[PDB]
């Protein structure tokens, strides 16, 4: 199954970015599956705030984050055969940005 343990990433963090902020873990994963992560925040406005590696399912943001303007974000996690073809999900990642 996927674990995508719920995040909080303070605002106004300061570089470097990308900055790795969690990860999601299969472990009984498949050869040579990846994990793909969609949503607000990612490839839905605001994009590219938040990117996932496909083979070690970290979860990296990529600038600084104002509470103000989004205090949260959730995304949606799977895992995929080599074509990208679903196979386990989707599951929530919660992303809150706090103060
Ligand atoms: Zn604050």
């Known amino acids: 199954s996927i674990v995508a343990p719920s995040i909080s990433i303070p605002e106004n963090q300061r570089i470097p970015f990308p900055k790795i902020v969690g990860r999601v873990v299969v472990s009984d ?31 990296s943001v990529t600038k ?27 599951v929530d990642l919660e992303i809150l940005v706090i103060d």
């Open 29 to 59: 994963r498949i050869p040579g599956s990846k994990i793909k992560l969609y949503g607000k925040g990612v490839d839905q406005e605001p994009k590219g705030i938040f990117k996932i590696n496909e083979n070690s399912g970290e979860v």
């Open 64 to 90: 600084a984050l104002d509470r103000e303007a989004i205090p949260s974000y959730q995304l949606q996690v799977e895992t995929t055969d080599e074509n990208g073809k679903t196979i386990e999900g989707p």
